Amino acid sequence: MASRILLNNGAKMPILGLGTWKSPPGQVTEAVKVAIDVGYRHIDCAHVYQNENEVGVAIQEKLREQVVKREELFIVSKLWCTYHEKGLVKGACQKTLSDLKLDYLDLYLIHWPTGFKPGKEFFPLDESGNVVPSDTNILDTWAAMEELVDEGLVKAIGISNFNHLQVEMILNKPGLKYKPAVNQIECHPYLTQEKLIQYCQSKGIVVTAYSPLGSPDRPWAKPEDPSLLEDPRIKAIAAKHNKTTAQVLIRFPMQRNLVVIPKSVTPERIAENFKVFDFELSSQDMTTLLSYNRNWRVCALLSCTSHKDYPFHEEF
Ligand SMILES: NC(=O)C1=CN([C@@H]2O[C@H](COP(=O)(O)OP(=O)(O)OC[C@H]3O[C@@H](n4cnc5c(N)ncnc54)[C@H](OP(=O)(O)O)[C@@H]3O)[C@@H](O)[C@H]2O)C=CC1
Numbered sequence: 001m002a003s004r005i006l007l008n009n010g011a012k013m014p015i016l017g018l019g020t021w022k023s024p025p026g027q028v029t030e031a032v033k034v035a036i037d038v039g040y041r042h043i044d045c046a047h048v049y050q051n052e053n054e055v056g057v058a059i060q061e062k063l064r065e066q067v068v069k070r071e072e073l074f075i076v077s078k079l080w081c082t083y084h085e086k087g088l089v090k091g092a093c094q095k096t097l098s099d100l101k102l103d104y105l106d107l108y109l110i111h112w113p114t115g116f117k118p119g120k121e122f123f124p125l126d127e128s129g130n131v132v133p134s135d136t137n138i139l140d141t142w143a144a145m146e147e148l149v150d151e152g153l154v155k156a157i158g159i160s161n162f163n164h165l166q167v168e169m170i171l172n173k174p175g176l177k178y179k180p181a182v183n184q185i186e187c188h189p190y191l192t193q194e195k196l197i198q199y200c201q202s203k204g205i206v207v208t209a210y211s212p213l214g215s216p217d218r219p220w221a222k223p224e225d226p227s228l229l230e231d232p233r234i235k236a237i238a239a240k241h242n243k244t245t246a247q248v249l250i251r252f253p254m255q256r257n258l259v260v261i262p263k264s265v266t267p268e269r270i271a272e273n274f275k276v277f278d279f280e281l282s283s284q285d286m287t288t289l290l291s292y293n294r295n296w297r298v299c300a301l302l303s304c305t306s307h308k309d310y311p312f313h314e315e316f
């Protein structure tokens with residue numbers, strides 16, 4: 001398959017990237033170095049993951065080493081919820097740039113559509129456990145993102161975890177200067193998101209699928225939850241193609257014209273997960289994988305569900 005997808009800013013984005021959530025700081029430098037050595041050219045990062053400095057060490061080494069040119073890398077980061085106010089967005093982006101050892105990002109996302117009270121705590125809580133919102137509206141945060149483009153800090157801007165009505169809000173913003181280039185959302189056979197994906201694709205937005213393996217290392221996993229990697233129906237599709245279950249799970253979103261960002265810190269798996277450009281799933285296989293949808297989510301958070309902009313009360 002074609003290795004990059006054209007964005008609405010005219011740039012090309014690699015359809016396979018390396019995820020970094022939960023990658024320990026002591027292991028993520030080696031993971032990113034190995035990824036770049038074996039061909040990855042897209043890295044998905046975020047301030048809230050607490051490992052951007054170590055990701056940046058890897059990127060800098062490979063650039064210094066002349067393993068890859070900066071123009072060939074596609075580095076993504078994300079604005080955390082406690083930085084949605086106008087006067088905090090530039091400094092948040094600049095901190096991420098400083099940590100990653102870069103003078104621009106390829107893509108900067110609003111991480112969640114919910115703004116939180118600014119401060120040191122990533123999840124500021126009231127005395128009863130609810131997250132404390134900010135009275136920032138999303139549209140104002142988008143205008144601050146647009147300024148980053150115009151200042152040269154970021155080449156493209158986008159959104160993450162926005163539902164159908166929030167995407168439409170952004171698209172209908174008075175005075176909109178830059179459309180979102182990407183919406184990064186959870187997507188896998190148990191949460192297939194057909195409705196949201198068709199909406200975004202109809203509007204020219206590229207969708208990135210996160211948690212494509214079902215995030216088996218999520219901190220809130222419960223021993224009895226569904227497990228994609230162990231699903232014998234997916235194992236059977238994999239066996240028919242002489243591929244691993246992970247390889248099928250990564251190829252699946254690629255054939256839906258999605259970008260996909262599997263995470264690993266294991267060098268062998270980082271390699272395995274990149275070898276997905278030499279087989280095709282049939283239409284029948286694709287439809288079968290889609291049939292496994294159960295509307296199950298990795299990423300949701302009870303403490304945030306009363307926030308006015310919490311995204312997952314809506315159908316899509
Ligand atoms: N925008 C947002 O709100 C969010 C963005 N994301 C992004 O998406 C990325 C991917 O999602 P994530 O939730 O991390 O989970 P994934 O679905 O990518 O699963 C990662 C887990 O799968 C394991 N694994 C990886 N490759 C294989 C393999 N070949 N065989 C068996 N097990 C494998 C990893 O183990 P090990 O590492 O030990 O090898 C790790 O435990 C994140 O890291 C982050 O960058 C995720 C959630 C939310």
Ligand SMILES: O=C(O)COc1cc(F)ccc1C(=S)NCc1ccc(Br)cc1F
Nearest residue numbers: 021046048049050112113114299300301304
């Ligand atoms: O968020 C990620 O990338 C991966 O997950 C996280 C990654 C982190 F480093 C810290 C917390 C999360 C959580 S708990 N994320 C869920 C979540 C956060 C905020 C809101 Br609004 C709703 C929600 F569902």
